Amino acid sequence: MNSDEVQLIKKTWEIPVATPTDSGAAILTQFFNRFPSNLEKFPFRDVPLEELSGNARFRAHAGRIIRVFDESIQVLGQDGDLEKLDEIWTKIAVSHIPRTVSKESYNQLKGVILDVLTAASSLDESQAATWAKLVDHVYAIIFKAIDDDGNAK
Ligand code: HEM
Ligand SMILES: [Cl-]
Ligand SMILES: [Mg+2]
Ligand SMILES: [Mg+2]
């Protein structure tokens, strides 16, 4: 990723990261609206869709997605970037093994994250592609740590 691309990610991230609560809720509500089976993994599985963002555990997970991306973006373009991303995302992958989060489930979330960011920062196609390169990189890291069903390899 060239220096222009890193800068673009950093600068466009400033908008959605300014509001972790709303931005994370946009991601996670969309995930559950499109792909409701994923609700069942959480303790808030029976909370009505319109009430999800009021649930504290929903808010915690929503905020985690934003914060982990923020941590990831912070390391870009500087020494140790690849190592630090591998660390971050390997740990995320292993953390979900006890919840059998499948590769399909991750891929469901992937498209929703990119959708939310594209809208939030008004990304053009080229800018969205730069974001997709980052996300695909981190997904490579996740996916070398799990089988298709989300178990350890
Ligand atoms: C960008 C992707 C994601 C990130 C960064 C993320 C991050 C996290 C983190 C940091 C935790 C806390 C782990 C702990 O208890 O120590 C967590 C828990 C959890 N995540 Fe994710 N997650 C992601 C995607 C997903 C997906 C796709 C699902 C699918 C349903 C999911 C389901 C869960 C569940 C069920 C928990 C445990 C909740 C509980 O124990 O009450 N996550 N996630
Ligand atoms: Cl579903
Ligand atoms: Mg297996
Ligand atoms: Mg099994």
Side-chain angles (χ1 to χ4, degrees), residues 47-112:
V47 174
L49 215 53
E50 76 277 12
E51 296 184 13
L52 288 167
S53 61
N55 176 276
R57 287 183 169 72
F58 173 100
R59 278 206 300 279
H61 194 268
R64 280 168 168 123
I65 291 170
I66 299 298
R67 286 186 280 278
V68 172
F69 271 95
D70 190 60
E71 288 281 311
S72 298
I73 291 160
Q74 283 173 31
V75 310
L76 299 177
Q78 300 296 130
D79 296 1
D81 51 357
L82 296 179
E83 296 88 337
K84 288 171 176 297
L85 293 171
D86 189 79
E87 179 185 9
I88 290 164
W89 289 95
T90 296
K91 178 171 183 76
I92 295 303
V94 174
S95 285
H96 292 83
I97 288 173
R99 294 293 182 287
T100 52
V101 176
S102 67
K103 291 185 176 181
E104 183 190 21
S105 180
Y106 280 112
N107 284 328
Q108 286 169 345
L109 187 65
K110 183 185 202 194
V112 163

Short mmCIF file of all heavy atoms in Angstrom, two decimals, residues 47-112:
data_model
loop_
_atom_site.label_atom_id
_atom_site.label_comp_id
_atom_site.label_asym_id
_atom_site.label_seq_id
_atom_site.Cartn_x
_atom_site.Cartn_y
_atom_site.Cartn_z
N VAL A 47 -33.38 -9.46 21.36
CA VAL A 47 -33.71 -8.04 21.40
C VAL A 47 -34.25 -7.65 20.04
O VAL A 47 -33.62 -7.96 19.02
CB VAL A 47 -32.46 -7.26 21.75
CG1 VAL A 47 -32.73 -5.70 21.65
CG2 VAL A 47 -31.98 -7.62 23.14
N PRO A 48 -35.40 -6.97 20.01
CA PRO A 48 -35.94 -6.50 18.73
C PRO A 48 -34.95 -5.68 17.91
O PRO A 48 -34.17 -4.92 18.50
CB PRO A 48 -37.15 -5.67 19.16
CG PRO A 48 -37.48 -5.98 20.53
CD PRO A 48 -36.27 -6.56 21.13
N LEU A 49 -34.98 -5.79 16.59
CA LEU A 49 -34.01 -5.10 15.76
C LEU A 49 -33.88 -3.61 16.10
O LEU A 49 -32.77 -3.07 16.18
CB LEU A 49 -34.39 -5.25 14.31
CG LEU A 49 -33.40 -5.37 13.19
CD1 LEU A 49 -32.38 -6.46 13.35
CD2 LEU A 49 -34.19 -5.60 11.91
N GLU A 50 -35.01 -2.92 16.26
CA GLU A 50 -35.01 -1.49 16.53
C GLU A 50 -34.46 -1.12 17.88
O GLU A 50 -34.22 0.04 18.12
CB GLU A 50 -36.42 -0.92 16.30
CG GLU A 50 -37.44 -1.18 17.33
CD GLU A 50 -38.14 -2.49 17.22
OE1 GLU A 50 -37.71 -3.40 16.46
OE2 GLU A 50 -39.20 -2.59 17.90
N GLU A 51 -34.35 -2.11 18.78
CA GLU A 51 -33.85 -1.90 20.12
C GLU A 51 -32.41 -2.34 20.28
O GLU A 51 -31.84 -2.14 21.34
CB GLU A 51 -34.74 -2.61 21.15
CG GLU A 51 -36.15 -2.01 21.17
CD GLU A 51 -37.06 -2.59 22.24
OE1 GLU A 51 -36.57 -3.27 23.12
OE2 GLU A 51 -38.28 -2.25 22.22
N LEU A 52 -31.79 -2.95 19.27
CA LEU A 52 -30.44 -3.44 19.43
C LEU A 52 -29.47 -2.38 19.89
O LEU A 52 -28.63 -2.65 20.74
CB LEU A 52 -29.92 -4.09 18.13
CG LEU A 52 -30.54 -5.42 17.77
CD1 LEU A 52 -30.17 -5.77 16.34
CD2 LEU A 52 -30.04 -6.51 18.72
N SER A 53 -29.52 -1.18 19.31
CA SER A 53 -28.51 -0.19 19.64
C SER A 53 -28.63 0.31 21.07
O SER A 53 -27.69 0.93 21.57
CB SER A 53 -28.57 0.99 18.67
OG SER A 53 -29.83 1.62 18.72
N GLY A 54 -29.76 0.04 21.74
CA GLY A 54 -29.89 0.35 23.14
C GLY A 54 -29.31 -0.67 24.07
O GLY A 54 -29.27 -0.44 25.28
N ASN A 55 -28.86 -1.79 23.56
CA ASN A 55 -28.39 -2.87 24.41
C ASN A 55 -26.90 -2.68 24.67
O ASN A 55 -26.11 -2.45 23.76
CB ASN A 55 -28.67 -4.20 23.72
CG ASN A 55 -28.13 -5.38 24.47
OD1 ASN A 55 -26.95 -5.71 24.33
ND2 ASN A 55 -28.96 -5.99 25.30
N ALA A 56 -26.51 -2.79 25.93
CA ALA A 56 -25.14 -2.51 26.31
C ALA A 56 -24.11 -3.47 25.70
O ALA A 56 -23.02 -3.05 25.33
CB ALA A 56 -25.03 -2.48 27.83
N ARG A 57 -24.48 -4.73 25.59
CA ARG A 57 -23.57 -5.67 25.00
C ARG A 57 -23.46 -5.48 23.49
O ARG A 57 -22.40 -5.67 22.92
CB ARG A 57 -23.95 -7.08 25.41
CG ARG A 57 -23.60 -7.34 26.86
CD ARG A 57 -23.90 -8.75 27.32
NE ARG A 57 -23.29 -8.99 28.63
CZ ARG A 57 -23.70 -8.48 29.79
NH1 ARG A 57 -24.77 -7.73 29.85
NH2 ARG A 57 -23.03 -8.74 30.92
N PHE A 58 -24.56 -5.14 22.83
CA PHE A 58 -24.47 -4.74 21.45
C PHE A 58 -23.51 -3.58 21.29
O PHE A 58 -22.63 -3.58 20.44
CB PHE A 58 -25.86 -4.39 20.94
CG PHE A 58 -25.87 -3.80 19.55
CD1 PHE A 58 -26.18 -4.57 18.44
CD2 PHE A 58 -25.62 -2.47 19.36
CE1 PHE A 58 -26.19 -4.00 17.19
CE2 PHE A 58 -25.61 -1.92 18.09
CZ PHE A 58 -25.95 -2.70 17.00
N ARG A 59 -23.67 -2.58 22.14
CA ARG A 59 -22.83 -1.38 22.06
C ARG A 59 -21.36 -1.71 22.28
O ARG A 59 -20.51 -1.16 21.60
CB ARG A 59 -23.30 -0.34 23.07
CG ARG A 59 -24.45 0.45 22.56
CD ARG A 59 -24.55 1.83 23.19
NE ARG A 59 -24.70 1.66 24.62
CZ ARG A 59 -25.85 1.38 25.23
NH1 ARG A 59 -26.98 1.28 24.55
NH2 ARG A 59 -25.90 1.20 26.53
N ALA A 60 -21.09 -2.65 23.17
CA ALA A 60 -19.74 -3.04 23.42
C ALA A 60 -19.12 -3.69 22.17
O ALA A 60 -17.99 -3.40 21.84
CB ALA A 60 -19.70 -4.00 24.61
N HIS A 61 -19.85 -4.58 21.51
CA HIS A 61 -19.28 -5.22 20.33
C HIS A 61 -19.13 -4.24 19.17
O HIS A 61 -18.16 -4.26 18.44
CB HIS A 61 -20.11 -6.45 19.90
CG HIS A 61 -19.38 -7.32 18.92
ND1 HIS A 61 -19.49 -7.19 17.56
CD2 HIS A 61 -18.50 -8.32 19.12
CE1 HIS A 61 -18.68 -8.07 16.98
NE2 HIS A 61 -18.09 -8.78 17.90
N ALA A 62 -20.14 -3.37 19.01
CA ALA A 62 -20.08 -2.36 17.99
C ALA A 62 -18.82 -1.50 18.15
O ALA A 62 -18.12 -1.16 17.20
CB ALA A 62 -21.36 -1.55 18.02
N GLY A 63 -18.59 -1.08 19.38
CA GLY A 63 -17.44 -0.25 19.72
C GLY A 63 -16.13 -0.99 19.53
O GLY A 63 -15.15 -0.37 19.08
N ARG A 64 -16.10 -2.29 19.80
CA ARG A 64 -14.92 -3.09 19.55
C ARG A 64 -14.56 -3.10 18.10
O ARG A 64 -13.39 -3.03 17.77
CB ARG A 64 -15.13 -4.53 20.04
CG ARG A 64 -14.94 -4.70 21.57
CD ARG A 64 -15.40 -6.03 22.16
NE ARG A 64 -14.91 -6.16 23.54
CZ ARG A 64 -15.64 -6.36 24.61
NH1 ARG A 64 -16.93 -6.57 24.55
NH2 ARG A 64 -15.02 -6.42 25.78
N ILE A 65 -15.52 -3.25 17.22
CA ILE A 65 -15.19 -3.27 15.80
C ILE A 65 -14.51 -1.94 15.43
O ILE A 65 -13.50 -1.92 14.75
CB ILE A 65 -16.46 -3.51 14.97
CG1 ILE A 65 -16.98 -4.93 15.18
CG2 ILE A 65 -16.19 -3.24 13.51
CD1 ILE A 65 -18.34 -5.19 14.61
N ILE A 66 -15.11 -0.83 15.85
CA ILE A 66 -14.51 0.48 15.53
C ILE A 66 -13.10 0.62 16.14
O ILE A 66 -12.18 1.07 15.46
CB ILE A 66 -15.43 1.63 15.98
CG1 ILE A 66 -16.78 1.56 15.25
CG2 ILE A 66 -14.73 2.96 15.74
CD1 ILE A 66 -16.74 1.71 13.75
N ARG A 67 -12.94 0.24 17.39
CA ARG A 67 -11.65 0.42 18.05
C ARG A 67 -10.57 -0.46 17.48
O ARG A 67 -9.42 -0.05 17.40
CB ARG A 67 -11.81 0.25 19.55
CG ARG A 67 -12.51 1.50 20.17
CD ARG A 67 -12.60 1.50 21.69
NE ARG A 67 -13.70 0.67 22.18
CZ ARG A 67 -14.97 1.06 22.23
NH1 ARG A 67 -15.38 2.25 21.79
NH2 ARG A 67 -15.85 0.21 22.71
N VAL A 68 -10.90 -1.70 17.09
CA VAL A 68 -9.91 -2.56 16.50
C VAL A 68 -9.49 -2.04 15.12
O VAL A 68 -8.31 -2.10 14.79
CB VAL A 68 -10.43 -4.03 16.45
CG1 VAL A 68 -9.51 -4.94 15.67
CG2 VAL A 68 -10.59 -4.56 17.89
N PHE A 69 -10.43 -1.57 14.33
CA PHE A 69 -10.03 -0.90 13.10
C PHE A 69 -9.19 0.34 13.37
O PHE A 69 -8.21 0.57 12.69
CB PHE A 69 -11.26 -0.57 12.24
CG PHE A 69 -11.60 -1.69 11.32
CD1 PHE A 69 -12.53 -2.62 11.62
CD2 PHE A 69 -10.84 -1.91 10.17
CE1 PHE A 69 -12.78 -3.67 10.74
CE2 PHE A 69 -11.11 -2.94 9.33
CZ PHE A 69 -12.10 -3.81 9.62
N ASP A 70 -9.53 1.10 14.41
CA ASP A 70 -8.72 2.28 14.71
C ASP A 70 -7.28 1.90 15.08
O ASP A 70 -6.32 2.52 14.60
CB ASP A 70 -9.35 3.07 15.83
CG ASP A 70 -8.71 4.38 16.00
OD1 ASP A 70 -8.69 5.20 15.09
OD2 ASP A 70 -8.14 4.64 17.08
N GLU A 71 -7.15 0.86 15.89
CA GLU A 71 -5.84 0.37 16.24
C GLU A 71 -5.02 -0.05 15.01
O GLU A 71 -3.81 0.19 14.94
CB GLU A 71 -5.98 -0.80 17.21
CG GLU A 71 -6.42 -0.48 18.60
CD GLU A 71 -5.29 0.04 19.41
OE1 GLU A 71 -4.20 -0.61 19.39
OE2 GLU A 71 -5.53 1.07 20.04
N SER A 72 -5.71 -0.67 14.08
CA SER A 72 -5.11 -1.17 12.86
C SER A 72 -4.64 -0.02 11.99
O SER A 72 -3.51 -0.03 11.45
CB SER A 72 -6.10 -2.00 12.08
OG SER A 72 -6.49 -3.15 12.84
N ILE A 73 -5.48 0.99 11.84
CA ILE A 73 -5.15 2.10 10.98
C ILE A 73 -3.99 2.89 11.56
O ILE A 73 -3.17 3.42 10.79
CB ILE A 73 -6.43 2.93 10.76
CG1 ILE A 73 -7.38 2.12 9.91
CG2 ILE A 73 -6.13 4.28 10.16
CD1 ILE A 73 -8.81 2.54 9.97
N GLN A 74 -3.90 2.95 12.88
CA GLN A 74 -2.82 3.65 13.53
C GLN A 74 -1.44 3.15 13.15
O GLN A 74 -0.46 3.90 13.22
CB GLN A 74 -2.99 3.60 15.05
CG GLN A 74 -4.02 4.54 15.58
CD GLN A 74 -4.33 4.39 17.08
OE1 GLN A 74 -3.48 4.01 17.91
NE2 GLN A 74 -5.58 4.70 17.42
N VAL A 75 -1.28 1.86 12.83
CA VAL A 75 0.03 1.31 12.55
C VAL A 75 0.47 1.44 11.11
O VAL A 75 1.61 1.19 10.78
CB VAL A 75 0.12 -0.18 12.98
CG1 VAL A 75 -0.35 -0.34 14.39
CG2 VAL A 75 -0.58 -1.09 12.04
N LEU A 76 -0.44 1.82 10.23
CA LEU A 76 -0.12 1.82 8.80
C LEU A 76 1.00 2.76 8.39
O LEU A 76 1.05 3.87 8.89
CB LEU A 76 -1.36 2.14 7.97
CG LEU A 76 -2.49 1.16 8.15
CD1 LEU A 76 -3.67 1.67 7.32
CD2 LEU A 76 -2.15 -0.27 7.76
N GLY A 77 1.80 2.30 7.42
CA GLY A 77 2.88 3.04 6.77
C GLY A 77 4.13 3.20 7.55
O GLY A 77 5.07 3.86 7.06
N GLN A 78 4.15 2.66 8.78
CA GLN A 78 5.32 2.73 9.63
C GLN A 78 5.86 1.39 9.95
O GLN A 78 5.20 0.38 9.77
CB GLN A 78 4.91 3.37 10.89
CG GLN A 78 4.37 4.77 10.65
CD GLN A 78 5.42 5.72 10.09
OE1 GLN A 78 5.19 6.44 9.07
NE2 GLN A 78 6.57 5.76 10.74
N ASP A 79 7.08 1.43 10.46
CA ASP A 79 7.77 0.20 10.67
C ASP A 79 6.98 -0.66 11.62
O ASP A 79 6.36 -0.15 12.55
CB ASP A 79 9.18 0.46 11.21
CG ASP A 79 10.07 1.23 10.25
OD1 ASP A 79 9.63 1.59 9.16
OD2 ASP A 79 11.24 1.46 10.53
N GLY A 80 6.98 -1.97 11.39
CA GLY A 80 6.25 -2.90 12.21
C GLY A 80 4.79 -3.07 11.85
O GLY A 80 4.08 -3.82 12.50
N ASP A 81 4.35 -2.43 10.79
CA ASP A 81 2.95 -2.48 10.41
C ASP A 81 2.44 -3.89 10.19
O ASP A 81 1.41 -4.29 10.72
CB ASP A 81 2.67 -1.59 9.13
CG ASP A 81 3.61 -1.85 7.92
OD1 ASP A 81 4.55 -2.64 7.94
OD2 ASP A 81 3.46 -1.17 6.88
N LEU A 82 3.13 -4.68 9.35
CA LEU A 82 2.66 -6.01 9.02
C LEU A 82 2.58 -6.90 10.26
O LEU A 82 1.63 -7.65 10.47
CB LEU A 82 3.53 -6.64 7.95
CG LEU A 82 3.50 -5.91 6.61
CD1 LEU A 82 4.45 -6.63 5.64
CD2 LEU A 82 2.14 -5.79 6.00
N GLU A 83 3.60 -6.79 11.08
CA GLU A 83 3.68 -7.54 12.34
C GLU A 83 2.54 -7.16 13.28
O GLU A 83 1.92 -8.02 13.90
CB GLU A 83 5.03 -7.27 13.01
CG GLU A 83 6.23 -7.75 12.24
CD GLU A 83 6.84 -6.78 11.21
OE1 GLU A 83 6.19 -5.85 10.71
OE2 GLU A 83 8.05 -6.97 10.91
N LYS A 84 2.31 -5.86 13.43
CA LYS A 84 1.29 -5.42 14.35
C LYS A 84 -0.10 -5.80 13.86
O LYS A 84 -0.96 -6.20 14.67
CB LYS A 84 1.40 -3.93 14.56
CG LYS A 84 2.60 -3.51 15.40
CD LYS A 84 2.81 -2.00 15.43
CE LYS A 84 3.96 -1.60 16.35
NZ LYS A 84 3.78 -1.91 17.75
N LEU A 85 -0.35 -5.73 12.55
CA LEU A 85 -1.63 -6.19 12.01
C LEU A 85 -1.82 -7.68 12.24
O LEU A 85 -2.90 -8.16 12.59
CB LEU A 85 -1.77 -5.85 10.54
CG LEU A 85 -1.87 -4.38 10.20
CD1 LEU A 85 -1.77 -4.17 8.72
CD2 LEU A 85 -3.17 -3.79 10.74
N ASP A 86 -0.76 -8.46 12.00
CA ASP A 86 -0.85 -9.89 12.20
C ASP A 86 -1.20 -10.17 13.66
O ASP A 86 -2.03 -11.06 13.95
CB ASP A 86 0.43 -10.59 11.82
CG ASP A 86 0.24 -12.08 11.81
OD1 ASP A 86 -0.31 -12.63 10.88
OD2 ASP A 86 0.59 -12.76 12.77
N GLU A 87 -0.58 -9.46 14.59
CA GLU A 87 -0.88 -9.65 16.00
C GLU A 87 -2.33 -9.32 16.29
O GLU A 87 -3.02 -10.09 16.95
CB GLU A 87 0.07 -8.79 16.83
CG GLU A 87 -0.22 -8.92 18.28
CD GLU A 87 0.60 -8.01 19.17
OE1 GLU A 87 1.35 -7.09 18.70
OE2 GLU A 87 0.49 -8.17 20.41
N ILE A 88 -2.78 -8.14 15.90
CA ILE A 88 -4.13 -7.68 16.20
C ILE A 88 -5.13 -8.73 15.72
O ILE A 88 -6.05 -9.13 16.44
CB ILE A 88 -4.37 -6.31 15.57
CG1 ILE A 88 -3.55 -5.22 16.30
CG2 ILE A 88 -5.84 -5.98 15.54
CD1 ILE A 88 -3.43 -3.94 15.52
N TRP A 89 -5.02 -9.07 14.45
CA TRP A 89 -6.10 -9.83 13.79
C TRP A 89 -6.02 -11.32 14.07
O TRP A 89 -7.04 -11.99 14.02
CB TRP A 89 -6.16 -9.46 12.32
CG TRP A 89 -6.68 -8.07 12.17
CD1 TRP A 89 -5.95 -6.91 12.04
CD2 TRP A 89 -8.03 -7.67 12.24
NE1 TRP A 89 -6.79 -5.83 12.02
CE2 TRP A 89 -8.07 -6.28 12.12
CE3 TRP A 89 -9.23 -8.36 12.36
CZ2 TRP A 89 -9.27 -5.58 12.10
CZ3 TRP A 89 -10.41 -7.66 12.34
CH2 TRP A 89 -10.42 -6.28 12.20
N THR A 90 -4.84 -11.84 14.37
CA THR A 90 -4.76 -13.21 14.84
C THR A 90 -5.48 -13.34 16.16
O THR A 90 -6.24 -14.29 16.40
CB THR A 90 -3.32 -13.68 14.93
OG1 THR A 90 -2.74 -13.70 13.62
CG2 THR A 90 -3.26 -15.09 15.48
N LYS A 91 -5.32 -12.35 17.02
CA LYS A 91 -5.99 -12.38 18.31
C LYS A 91 -7.51 -12.27 18.14
O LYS A 91 -8.25 -13.02 18.76
CB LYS A 91 -5.45 -11.29 19.25
CG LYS A 91 -6.18 -11.28 20.57
CD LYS A 91 -5.52 -10.37 21.59
CE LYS A 91 -6.24 -10.46 22.90
NZ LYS A 91 -5.92 -11.72 23.65
N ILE A 92 -7.96 -11.41 17.26
CA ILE A 92 -9.40 -11.36 16.99
C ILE A 92 -9.90 -12.71 16.50
O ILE A 92 -10.92 -13.22 16.95
CB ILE A 92 -9.70 -10.27 15.95
CG1 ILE A 92 -9.38 -8.88 16.49
CG2 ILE A 92 -11.14 -10.34 15.50
CD1 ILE A 92 -10.09 -8.51 17.75
N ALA A 93 -9.19 -13.33 15.57
CA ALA A 93 -9.63 -14.60 15.03
C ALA A 93 -9.73 -15.65 16.14
O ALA A 93 -10.74 -16.35 16.27
CB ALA A 93 -8.70 -15.08 13.94
N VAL A 94 -8.69 -15.74 16.93
CA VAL A 94 -8.70 -16.77 17.96
C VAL A 94 -9.79 -16.47 18.99
O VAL A 94 -10.44 -17.42 19.47
CB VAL A 94 -7.31 -16.91 18.56
CG1 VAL A 94 -7.33 -17.86 19.72
CG2 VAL A 94 -6.36 -17.42 17.47
N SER A 95 -10.06 -15.22 19.28
CA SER A 95 -11.10 -14.86 20.24
C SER A 95 -12.49 -15.35 19.82
O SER A 95 -13.35 -15.49 20.68
CB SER A 95 -11.15 -13.33 20.44
OG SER A 95 -10.06 -12.92 21.22
N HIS A 96 -12.75 -15.55 18.55
CA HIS A 96 -14.06 -15.98 18.09
C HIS A 96 -14.18 -17.49 17.94
O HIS A 96 -15.29 -17.96 17.71
CB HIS A 96 -14.43 -15.25 16.80
CG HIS A 96 -14.67 -13.79 16.99
ND1 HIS A 96 -13.66 -12.86 17.01
CD2 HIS A 96 -15.82 -13.11 17.24
CE1 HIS A 96 -14.20 -11.65 17.23
NE2 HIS A 96 -15.51 -11.78 17.34
N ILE A 97 -13.09 -18.24 18.04
CA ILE A 97 -13.16 -19.70 17.91
C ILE A 97 -14.20 -20.32 18.83
O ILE A 97 -14.97 -21.18 18.39
CB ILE A 97 -11.77 -20.31 18.04
CG1 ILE A 97 -10.96 -19.98 16.80
CG2 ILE A 97 -11.86 -21.80 18.29
CD1 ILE A 97 -9.51 -20.37 16.89
N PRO A 98 -14.33 -19.86 20.08
CA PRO A 98 -15.37 -20.39 20.97
C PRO A 98 -16.79 -20.04 20.59
O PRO A 98 -17.70 -20.42 21.31
CB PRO A 98 -15.01 -19.76 22.36
CG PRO A 98 -13.58 -19.47 22.22
CD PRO A 98 -13.43 -18.96 20.83
N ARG A 99 -16.98 -19.22 19.59
CA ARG A 99 -18.28 -18.85 19.12
C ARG A 99 -18.54 -19.34 17.69
O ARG A 99 -19.55 -19.00 17.10
CB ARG A 99 -18.45 -17.33 19.16
CG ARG A 99 -18.45 -16.78 20.54
CD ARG A 99 -19.68 -17.24 21.34
NE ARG A 99 -19.65 -16.62 22.67
CZ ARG A 99 -18.82 -16.97 23.65
NH1 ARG A 99 -18.09 -18.07 23.58
NH2 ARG A 99 -18.76 -16.25 24.76
N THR A 100 -17.65 -20.16 17.13
CA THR A 100 -17.74 -20.71 15.79
C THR A 100 -18.28 -19.69 14.80
O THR A 100 -19.29 -19.94 14.13
CB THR A 100 -18.51 -22.03 15.75
OG1 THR A 100 -19.78 -21.90 16.39
CG2 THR A 100 -17.72 -23.16 16.40
N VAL A 101 -17.59 -18.57 14.69
CA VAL A 101 -17.85 -17.56 13.69
C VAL A 101 -17.21 -18.00 12.38
O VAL A 101 -15.98 -18.10 12.28
CB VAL A 101 -17.35 -16.17 14.13
CG1 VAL A 101 -17.55 -15.16 13.04
CG2 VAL A 101 -18.04 -15.77 15.42
N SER A 102 -18.04 -18.34 11.41
CA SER A 102 -17.58 -18.95 10.19
C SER A 102 -16.94 -17.94 9.27
O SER A 102 -17.14 -16.73 9.39
CB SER A 102 -18.73 -19.59 9.49
OG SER A 102 -19.62 -18.60 9.02
N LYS A 103 -16.24 -18.44 8.25
CA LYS A 103 -15.75 -17.54 7.24
C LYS A 103 -16.90 -16.83 6.50
O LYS A 103 -16.77 -15.66 6.18
CB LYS A 103 -14.82 -18.27 6.26
CG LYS A 103 -13.52 -18.65 6.98
CD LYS A 103 -12.48 -19.27 6.09
CE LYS A 103 -11.20 -19.51 6.89
NZ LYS A 103 -10.07 -20.09 6.17
N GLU A 104 -18.02 -17.53 6.28
CA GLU A 104 -19.18 -16.88 5.73
C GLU A 104 -19.65 -15.71 6.60
O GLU A 104 -19.94 -14.64 6.07
CB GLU A 104 -20.32 -17.89 5.52
CG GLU A 104 -21.52 -17.23 4.88
CD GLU A 104 -22.77 -18.04 4.83
OE1 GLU A 104 -22.88 -18.98 5.63
OE2 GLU A 104 -23.63 -17.75 3.97
N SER A 105 -19.72 -15.93 7.91
CA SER A 105 -20.12 -14.86 8.81
C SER A 105 -19.17 -13.68 8.73
O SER A 105 -19.60 -12.53 8.65
CB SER A 105 -20.17 -15.42 10.22
OG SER A 105 -20.53 -14.47 11.17
N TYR A 106 -17.86 -13.90 8.79
CA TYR A 106 -16.91 -12.84 8.58
C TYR A 106 -17.13 -12.13 7.24
O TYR A 106 -17.09 -10.90 7.17
CB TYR A 106 -15.48 -13.31 8.67
CG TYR A 106 -14.95 -13.49 10.08
CD1 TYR A 106 -14.67 -14.76 10.56
CD2 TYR A 106 -14.70 -12.40 10.89
CE1 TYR A 106 -14.12 -14.90 11.82
CE2 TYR A 106 -14.17 -12.53 12.15
CZ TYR A 106 -13.85 -13.80 12.61
OH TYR A 106 -13.28 -13.92 13.83
N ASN A 107 -17.34 -12.88 6.17
CA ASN A 107 -17.53 -12.27 4.85
C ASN A 107 -18.83 -11.48 4.79
O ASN A 107 -18.88 -10.43 4.14
CB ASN A 107 -17.44 -13.33 3.77
CG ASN A 107 -16.02 -13.74 3.50
OD1 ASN A 107 -15.09 -12.94 3.63
ND2 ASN A 107 -15.83 -15.02 3.13
N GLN A 108 -19.87 -11.91 5.51
CA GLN A 108 -21.08 -11.14 5.67
C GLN A 108 -20.76 -9.78 6.31
O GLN A 108 -21.20 -8.73 5.83
CB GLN A 108 -22.09 -11.93 6.53
CG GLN A 108 -22.73 -13.08 5.80
CD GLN A 108 -23.51 -14.00 6.72
OE1 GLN A 108 -23.35 -13.97 7.93
NE2 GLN A 108 -24.35 -14.84 6.14
N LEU A 109 -19.98 -9.78 7.38
CA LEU A 109 -19.63 -8.54 8.04
C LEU A 109 -18.76 -7.67 7.15
O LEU A 109 -18.88 -6.44 7.18
CB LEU A 109 -18.92 -8.84 9.38
CG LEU A 109 -18.65 -7.60 10.23
CD1 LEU A 109 -19.90 -6.93 10.72
CD2 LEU A 109 -17.77 -7.93 11.41
N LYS A 110 -17.89 -8.30 6.39
CA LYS A 110 -16.94 -7.56 5.54
C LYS A 110 -17.67 -6.61 4.59
O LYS A 110 -17.32 -5.43 4.46
CB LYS A 110 -16.10 -8.55 4.73
CG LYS A 110 -15.03 -8.00 3.85
CD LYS A 110 -14.38 -9.18 3.02
CE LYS A 110 -12.99 -8.90 2.50
NZ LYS A 110 -12.70 -9.95 1.48
N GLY A 111 -18.67 -7.13 3.89
CA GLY A 111 -19.37 -6.32 2.95
C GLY A 111 -20.11 -5.20 3.62
O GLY A 111 -20.21 -4.10 3.10
N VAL A 112 -20.61 -5.44 4.82
CA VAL A 112 -21.34 -4.43 5.58
C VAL A 112 -20.41 -3.35 6.07
O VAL A 112 -20.74 -2.17 5.99
CB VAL A 112 -22.06 -5.09 6.72
CG1 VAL A 112 -22.47 -4.09 7.74
CG2 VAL A 112 -23.21 -5.99 6.22
#
